[PDB]
Short mmCIF file of C-alpha atoms in Angstrom, two decimals:
data_model
loop_
_atom_site.label_atom_id
_atom_site.label_comp_id
_atom_site.label_asym_id
_atom_site.label_seq_id
_atom_site.Cartn_x
_atom_site.Cartn_y
_atom_site.Cartn_z
CA UNK A 1 0.00 0.00 0.00
CA UNK A 2 0.86 3.68 0.39
CA UNK A 3 4.09 4.30 2.36
CA UNK A 4 3.52 5.69 5.87
CA UNK A 5 5.47 8.84 4.89
CA UNK A 6 3.00 9.58 2.06
CA UNK A 7 0.07 8.79 4.29
CA UNK A 8 1.19 11.17 6.97
CA UNK A 9 1.76 13.91 4.39
CA UNK A 10 -1.79 13.34 3.07
CA UNK A 11 -3.26 13.65 6.55
CA UNK A 12 -1.32 16.85 7.22
CA UNK A 13 -2.61 18.27 3.94
CA UNK A 14 -6.20 17.31 4.80
CA UNK A 15 -6.01 18.83 8.29
CA UNK A 16 -4.43 22.01 6.84
CA UNK A 17 -7.17 22.30 4.19
CA UNK A 18 -9.71 22.35 7.03
CA UNK A 19 -7.72 24.59 9.46
CA UNK A 20 -5.94 27.26 7.43
CA UNK A 21 -8.87 29.70 7.40
CA UNK A 22 -9.15 29.48 11.20
CA UNK A 23 -5.46 30.33 11.50
CA UNK A 24 -5.87 33.19 9.03
CA UNK A 25 -8.93 34.53 10.81
CA UNK A 26 -7.70 34.28 14.40
CA UNK A 27 -3.93 34.44 13.96
CA UNK A 28 -1.42 31.81 14.99
CA UNK A 29 -1.13 33.10 18.58
CA UNK A 30 -4.89 33.03 19.31
CA UNK A 31 -5.24 29.81 17.35
CA UNK A 32 -4.74 26.74 19.47
CA UNK A 33 -4.46 23.07 18.77
CA UNK A 34 -7.72 22.14 20.50
CA UNK A 35 -9.76 24.50 18.27
CA UNK A 36 -7.91 23.30 15.17
CA UNK A 37 -8.62 19.70 16.22
CA UNK A 38 -12.33 20.64 16.63
CA UNK A 39 -12.45 22.36 13.19
CA UNK A 40 -10.66 19.52 11.38
CA UNK A 41 -12.91 16.91 12.99
CA UNK A 42 -10.06 15.28 14.93
CA UNK A 43 -9.42 14.36 18.55
CA UNK A 44 -6.61 16.27 20.31
CA UNK A 45 -4.42 13.15 20.36
CA UNK A 46 -4.95 12.50 16.66
CA UNK A 47 -3.93 16.06 15.72
CA UNK A 48 -0.68 15.79 17.75
CA UNK A 49 0.08 12.59 15.83
CA UNK A 50 0.54 14.67 12.64
CA UNK A 51 1.77 18.07 13.84
CA UNK A 52 4.47 19.02 16.36
CA UNK A 53 2.63 22.25 17.17
CA UNK A 54 0.95 25.27 15.63
CA UNK A 55 4.22 26.48 14.07
CA UNK A 56 4.23 23.38 11.82
CA UNK A 57 0.58 23.99 10.91
CA UNK A 58 1.48 27.56 9.95
CA UNK A 59 4.16 26.14 7.63
CA UNK A 60 1.77 23.68 5.99
CA UNK A 61 -0.89 26.43 5.78
CA UNK A 62 1.63 28.45 3.72
CA UNK A 63 2.22 25.41 1.48
CA UNK A 64 -1.54 25.14 1.09
CA UNK A 65 -2.08 28.76 -0.02
CA UNK A 66 1.03 28.66 -2.24
CA UNK A 67 -0.26 25.55 -4.02
CA UNK A 68 -3.81 26.94 -4.22
CA UNK A 69 -2.52 30.20 -5.74
CA UNK A 70 -0.38 28.21 -8.24
CA UNK A 71 -3.40 26.10 -9.22
CA UNK A 72 -5.58 29.16 -9.79
CA UNK A 73 -2.85 30.68 -12.02
CA UNK A 74 -2.41 27.43 -14.03
CA UNK A 75 -6.19 27.12 -14.49
CA UNK A 76 -6.75 30.78 -15.47
CA UNK A 77 -3.81 31.16 -17.92
CA UNK A 78 -5.02 29.11 -20.87
CA UNK A 79 -3.26 30.40 -24.00
CA UNK A 80 -2.50 33.92 -22.62
CA UNK A 81 0.83 35.60 -23.34
CA UNK A 82 2.48 38.91 -22.51
CA UNK A 83 0.52 41.41 -20.45
CA UNK A 84 -2.69 39.33 -20.63
CA UNK A 85 -0.85 36.46 -18.90
CA UNK A 86 0.85 38.83 -16.46
CA UNK A 87 -2.50 40.34 -15.41
CA UNK A 88 -3.94 36.83 -14.91
CA UNK A 89 -1.02 35.83 -12.67
CA UNK A 90 -1.10 39.08 -10.69
CA UNK A 91 -4.85 38.83 -10.03
CA UNK A 92 -4.28 35.45 -8.27
CA UNK A 93 -1.31 36.72 -6.23
CA UNK A 94 -2.74 40.09 -5.07
CA UNK A 95 -5.20 40.09 -2.10
CA UNK A 96 -8.13 41.36 -4.22
CA UNK A 97 -10.90 39.34 -2.51
CA UNK A 98 -11.67 37.91 0.92
CA UNK A 99 -10.19 34.44 0.22
CA UNK A 100 -6.98 36.08 -1.00
CA UNK A 101 -6.86 38.39 2.04
CA UNK A 102 -6.95 35.25 4.20
CA UNK A 103 -4.04 33.95 2.10
CA UNK A 104 -2.22 37.26 2.70
CA UNK A 105 -2.67 36.79 6.49
CA UNK A 106 -1.01 33.35 6.32
CA UNK A 107 1.89 34.68 4.20
CA UNK A 108 2.44 37.73 6.48
CA UNK A 109 2.59 35.39 9.49
CA UNK A 110 4.99 32.85 7.92
CA UNK A 111 7.48 35.46 6.60
CA UNK A 112 9.11 36.64 9.89
CA UNK A 113 9.37 32.98 10.87
CA UNK A 114 11.15 32.14 7.64
CA UNK A 115 13.64 34.94 8.46
CA UNK A 116 15.13 32.76 11.25
CA UNK A 117 14.63 29.26 9.77
CA UNK A 118 15.69 27.20 6.71
CA UNK A 119 12.91 24.58 6.42
CA UNK A 120 10.35 27.42 6.99
CA UNK A 121 12.11 29.42 4.34
CA UNK A 122 12.56 26.69 1.72
CA UNK A 123 9.01 26.60 0.31
CA UNK A 124 9.11 30.42 0.18
CA UNK A 125 12.18 31.03 -2.04
CA UNK A 126 10.88 28.39 -4.45
CA UNK A 127 7.40 29.97 -4.60
CA UNK A 128 8.91 33.45 -5.17
CA UNK A 129 11.31 32.18 -7.86
CA UNK A 130 8.56 30.25 -9.65
CA UNK A 131 6.59 33.49 -9.91
CA UNK A 132 9.67 35.49 -10.95
CA UNK A 133 10.34 32.98 -13.73
CA UNK A 134 6.80 33.16 -15.14
CA UNK A 135 6.63 36.95 -14.79
CA UNK A 136 9.93 37.28 -16.70
CA UNK A 137 8.57 35.08 -19.53
CA UNK A 138 5.43 37.20 -19.76
CA UNK A 139 7.31 40.51 -19.63
CA UNK A 140 9.80 39.42 -22.29
CA UNK A 141 6.81 38.41 -24.46
CA UNK A 142 5.33 41.92 -23.95
CA UNK A 143 8.70 43.49 -24.78
CA UNK A 144 8.89 41.54 -28.06
CA UNK A 145 5.20 42.24 -28.85
CA UNK A 146 5.71 45.97 -28.22
CA UNK A 147 3.04 46.23 -25.49
CA UNK A 148 5.80 47.65 -23.27
CA UNK A 149 8.99 49.55 -24.19
CA UNK A 150 12.56 48.25 -24.07
CA UNK A 151 12.28 47.41 -20.38
CA UNK A 152 14.83 45.89 -18.02
CA UNK A 153 12.87 42.66 -17.48
CA UNK A 154 14.75 41.50 -14.34
CA UNK A 155 14.20 44.85 -12.56
CA UNK A 156 10.54 45.15 -13.70
CA UNK A 157 9.83 41.63 -12.39
CA UNK A 158 11.38 42.64 -9.04
CA UNK A 159 9.40 45.90 -8.90
CA UNK A 160 6.12 44.06 -9.49
CA UNK A 161 6.87 41.16 -7.18
CA UNK A 162 7.86 43.55 -4.38
CA UNK A 163 4.72 45.64 -4.97
CA UNK A 164 2.50 42.54 -4.72
CA UNK A 165 4.28 41.30 -1.60
CA UNK A 166 3.71 44.74 0.02
CA UNK A 167 0.04 44.38 -0.90
CA UNK A 168 -0.19 41.28 1.28
CA UNK A 169 0.65 43.55 4.19
CA UNK A 170 -1.19 46.79 3.30
CA UNK A 171 -4.22 45.18 1.60
CA UNK A 172 -4.82 43.69 5.07
CA UNK A 173 -3.59 46.44 7.41
CA UNK A 174 -4.70 49.54 5.46
CA UNK A 175 -7.73 48.23 3.51
CA UNK A 176 -9.14 51.74 2.89
CA UNK A 177 -5.98 52.93 1.12
CA UNK A 178 -5.14 49.53 -0.31
CA UNK A 179 -8.59 48.29 -1.30
CA UNK A 180 -9.22 45.66 -3.98
CA UNK A 181 -10.14 48.36 -6.48
CA UNK A 182 -6.97 50.38 -5.64
CA UNK A 183 -4.81 47.25 -6.06
CA UNK A 184 -6.21 46.66 -9.53
CA UNK A 185 -5.63 50.32 -10.45
CA UNK A 186 -2.04 50.13 -9.11
CA UNK A 187 -1.45 47.13 -11.41
CA UNK A 188 -3.03 48.85 -14.45
CA UNK A 189 -1.11 52.09 -14.04
CA UNK A 190 2.13 50.21 -13.40
CA UNK A 191 1.86 48.22 -16.66
CA UNK A 192 0.77 51.38 -18.55
CA UNK A 193 4.02 53.07 -17.46
CA UNK A 194 6.15 50.29 -19.01
CA UNK B 1 3.96 63.55 39.78
CA UNK B 2 5.25 64.63 36.38
CA UNK B 3 8.98 64.00 37.02
CA UNK B 4 8.16 60.38 37.95
CA UNK B 5 6.10 59.90 34.76
CA UNK B 6 8.89 61.44 32.65
CA UNK B 7 11.43 59.11 34.32
CA UNK B 8 9.20 56.12 33.62
CA UNK B 9 8.79 57.09 29.94
CA UNK B 10 12.52 57.80 29.53
CA UNK B 11 13.29 54.36 30.94
CA UNK B 12 10.89 52.67 28.51
CA UNK B 13 12.59 54.53 25.65
CA UNK B 14 16.06 53.46 26.88
CA UNK B 15 15.03 49.81 27.28
CA UNK B 16 13.49 49.89 23.78
CA UNK B 17 16.69 51.38 22.35
CA UNK B 18 18.67 48.61 24.11
CA UNK B 19 16.32 45.80 23.00
CA UNK B 20 15.30 46.43 19.42
CA UNK B 21 18.40 44.96 17.74
CA UNK B 22 18.08 41.77 19.81
CA UNK B 23 14.46 41.45 18.72
CA UNK B 24 15.38 42.09 15.05
CA UNK B 25 18.35 39.67 15.20
CA UNK B 26 16.65 36.65 16.81
CA UNK B 27 12.97 37.41 16.08
CA UNK B 28 10.16 38.00 18.57
CA UNK B 29 9.39 34.27 18.97
CA UNK B 30 12.92 33.37 20.13
CA UNK B 31 13.31 36.62 22.09
CA UNK B 32 12.14 36.46 25.71
CA UNK B 33 11.93 39.00 28.58
CA UNK B 34 14.92 37.57 30.50
CA UNK B 35 17.17 38.16 27.46
CA UNK B 36 15.71 41.63 26.84
CA UNK B 37 16.30 42.46 30.53
CA UNK B 38 19.97 41.37 30.34
CA UNK B 39 20.64 43.44 27.19
CA UNK B 40 19.15 46.51 28.90
CA UNK B 41 21.07 45.93 32.15
CA UNK B 42 17.91 45.31 34.21
CA UNK B 43 16.62 42.47 36.42
CA UNK B 44 13.41 40.72 35.33
CA UNK B 45 11.64 42.05 38.41
CA UNK B 46 12.65 45.61 37.49
CA UNK B 47 11.78 45.20 33.78
CA UNK B 48 8.18 44.13 34.64
CA UNK B 49 7.61 47.65 36.00
CA UNK B 50 8.03 49.16 32.52
CA UNK B 51 6.77 46.48 30.14
CA UNK B 52 4.03 43.83 30.47
CA UNK B 53 5.52 41.48 27.88
CA UNK B 54 7.64 41.18 24.76
CA UNK B 55 4.83 42.19 22.37
CA UNK B 56 4.70 45.67 23.86
CA UNK B 57 8.49 45.92 23.43
CA UNK B 58 8.03 44.86 19.80
CA UNK B 59 5.53 47.70 19.40
CA UNK B 60 7.80 50.30 20.97
CA UNK B 61 10.73 48.91 18.89
CA UNK B 62 8.67 49.62 15.78
CA UNK B 63 7.96 53.17 17.04
CA UNK B 64 11.71 53.54 17.73
CA UNK B 65 12.73 52.57 14.18
CA UNK B 66 9.93 54.75 12.70
CA UNK B 67 11.19 57.75 14.67
CA UNK B 68 14.81 56.92 13.69
CA UNK B 69 13.83 56.74 9.99
CA UNK B 70 11.88 60.02 10.16
CA UNK B 71 14.91 61.73 11.69
CA UNK B 72 17.14 60.44 8.87
CA UNK B 73 14.65 61.80 6.30
CA UNK B 74 14.32 65.21 8.02
CA UNK B 75 18.10 65.63 8.24
CA UNK B 76 18.80 64.55 4.63
CA UNK B 77 16.03 66.56 2.92
CA UNK B 78 17.41 70.13 3.11
CA UNK B 79 16.03 72.14 0.17
CA UNK B 80 14.93 69.12 -1.87
CA UNK B 81 11.49 69.11 -3.51
CA UNK B 82 9.62 66.90 -5.97
CA UNK B 83 11.39 63.83 -7.34
CA UNK B 84 14.64 64.69 -5.49
CA UNK B 85 12.88 64.80 -2.14
CA UNK B 86 11.05 61.56 -3.03
CA UNK B 87 14.34 59.75 -3.70
CA UNK B 88 15.74 60.93 -0.37
CA UNK B 89 12.77 59.57 1.62
CA UNK B 90 12.84 56.27 -0.25
CA UNK B 91 16.52 55.64 0.52
CA UNK B 92 15.78 55.86 4.27
CA UNK B 93 12.74 53.55 4.09
CA UNK B 94 14.14 50.77 1.83
CA UNK B 95 16.42 48.11 3.47
CA UNK B 96 19.53 49.12 1.46
CA UNK B 97 22.05 48.57 4.25
CA UNK B 98 22.64 46.34 7.21
CA UNK B 99 20.99 48.50 9.77
CA UNK B 100 17.99 49.05 7.59
CA UNK B 101 17.73 45.24 7.16
CA UNK B 102 17.45 45.04 10.95
CA UNK B 103 14.65 47.66 10.82
CA UNK B 104 13.00 45.55 8.11
CA UNK B 105 12.96 42.55 10.49
CA UNK B 106 11.16 44.59 13.17
CA UNK B 107 8.49 45.61 10.64
CA UNK B 108 8.09 42.00 9.41
CA UNK B 109 7.58 40.76 12.99
CA UNK B 110 5.10 43.46 13.94
CA UNK B 111 2.91 43.26 10.82
CA UNK B 112 1.26 39.85 11.43
CA UNK B 113 0.74 40.69 15.10
CA UNK B 114 -0.87 44.03 14.09
CA UNK B 115 -3.29 41.97 11.99
CA UNK B 116 -4.80 40.73 15.33
CA UNK B 117 -4.01 43.64 17.68
CA UNK B 118 -5.62 47.12 17.62
CA UNK B 119 -2.70 48.98 19.29
CA UNK B 120 -0.09 47.51 16.93
CA UNK B 121 -2.37 48.14 13.94
CA UNK B 122 -2.68 51.79 15.10
CA UNK B 123 1.10 52.13 15.49
CA UNK B 124 1.62 50.79 11.96
CA UNK B 125 -1.10 53.05 10.45
CA UNK B 126 0.54 56.16 11.93
CA UNK B 127 3.84 55.32 10.24
CA UNK B 128 2.29 54.34 6.89
CA UNK B 129 0.13 57.48 6.84
CA UNK B 130 3.07 59.77 7.64
CA UNK B 131 4.97 58.34 4.67
CA UNK B 132 1.94 58.48 2.35
CA UNK B 133 1.47 62.14 3.26
CA UNK B 134 5.12 63.10 2.65
CA UNK B 135 5.28 61.14 -0.62
CA UNK B 136 2.08 62.80 -1.91
CA UNK B 137 3.53 66.28 -1.25
CA UNK B 138 6.66 65.47 -3.26
CA UNK B 139 4.73 64.01 -6.19
CA UNK B 140 2.36 66.97 -6.32
CA UNK B 141 5.48 69.17 -6.31
CA UNK B 142 6.81 67.13 -9.27
CA UNK B 143 3.53 67.72 -11.17
CA UNK B 144 3.66 71.45 -10.35
CA UNK B 145 7.33 71.59 -11.43
CA UNK B 146 6.55 69.83 -14.71
CA UNK B 147 9.06 67.03 -14.11
CA UNK B 148 6.45 64.26 -14.43
CA UNK B 149 3.56 63.58 -16.80
CA UNK B 150 -0.08 63.70 -15.75
CA UNK B 151 0.39 61.20 -12.89
CA UNK B 152 -2.25 59.93 -10.47
CA UNK B 153 -0.55 60.95 -7.22
CA UNK B 154 -2.68 58.79 -4.92
CA UNK B 155 -2.04 55.64 -6.98
CA UNK B 156 1.68 56.33 -7.51
CA UNK B 157 2.13 56.87 -3.75
CA UNK B 158 0.43 53.53 -3.14
CA UNK B 159 2.53 51.76 -5.80
CA UNK B 160 5.78 52.98 -4.33
CA UNK B 161 4.80 52.43 -0.70
CA UNK B 162 3.69 48.85 -1.42
CA UNK B 163 6.90 48.20 -3.34
CA UNK B 164 9.00 49.48 -0.42
CA UNK B 165 7.06 47.39 2.11
CA UNK B 166 7.55 44.25 -0.03
CA UNK B 167 11.29 45.04 0.00
CA UNK B 168 11.24 44.74 3.83
CA UNK B 169 10.31 41.06 3.32
CA UNK B 170 12.29 40.15 0.17
CA UNK B 171 15.40 42.19 1.10
CA UNK B 172 15.78 39.66 3.89
CA UNK B 173 14.23 36.50 2.42
CA UNK B 174 15.64 36.71 -1.15
CA UNK B 175 18.73 38.91 -0.68
CA UNK B 176 20.29 37.94 -4.05
CA UNK B 177 17.33 39.06 -6.17
CA UNK B 178 16.47 41.91 -3.79
CA UNK B 179 20.00 43.13 -3.05
CA UNK B 180 20.79 46.69 -2.02
CA UNK B 181 21.89 47.44 -5.60
CA UNK B 182 18.68 45.99 -7.05
CA UNK B 183 16.53 48.00 -4.64
CA UNK B 184 18.22 51.19 -5.78
CA UNK B 185 17.72 50.12 -9.42
CA UNK B 186 14.02 49.43 -8.71
CA UNK B 187 13.63 52.94 -7.27
CA UNK B 188 15.52 54.65 -10.14
CA UNK B 189 13.58 52.86 -12.90
CA UNK B 190 10.25 53.48 -11.14
CA UNK B 191 10.91 57.23 -10.85
CA UNK B 192 12.24 57.40 -14.43
CA UNK B 193 8.90 56.04 -15.74
CA UNK B 194 6.85 58.82 -14.05
#
């Protein structure tokens, strides 16, 4: 049958699927294992079987939202190229709706943790680089199509990526000034300037 | 009376000044009040008279770095207006040197806690709003001086602020792609496109 390692991974993924919104909504500090156990439909003992503590569940929550974002991008892209593809990707990454604001809350919480840890950092650098790579393809396409000028693709990718990572913070913390509509306008005006 | 209150506030400021680098360097999770006490030259008993816990010291650490940044801006501005003034502010906010990378780590730790704490949220909003206000003045000045096109000041402020907040995360987490040089290049190319 399935190796125990794979089985335990599956269970962690299932528990995370059920718990990540609670962590996003309450924050990792207010979140506690007993409430997560309740919400995932597990006993306390069973939950401890799969997770060392809430820190590990924060890590897997970040894996969850990273994978979910990636899947939305892959499903939305179709045959898009250039700026059409870039807008599609950006709309999945930016916190432009309530589900994506919950994702932003998980990311914002994981980041300072990743600053002091390798395992916690690993899934992050890969996620960021995967997006950089796609963004660079799309921006080079735009450059060759003439939908943007003779841009410095590496620097433009970094500008946009940094802007969208800032949105995870400010879209949550200053939602008047960094509303969904404002985020979309910031993207449009940015690409217009290229 | 008043002298006692002033003494109390001065001591909190001194402890904060003595603690913030420790908090940036090890992170708020690994930091504890015993270690903060030792770096400030206090006993734990004595420290409990000024601070209730490490989260309050994180908040005052953020205020400390915000005040420090504002001082750097004020001093460096001189007679600068418009795009020149904007560049000066941005160089103090972005994590383009080692000390500013420490400041970035304070911000990154406070943000997710502010997402679940009214006082920390308020502290962050004050800093973000101060910078939005300054940046808007400079960009209006640029428009009035005829050094930019017909820019949407509100949106451009938001673009640049979000970009700079993302840098606080990526400057630490992806220091190759978000190096000091690349941050400066991001700023220059952004301003050039206005």
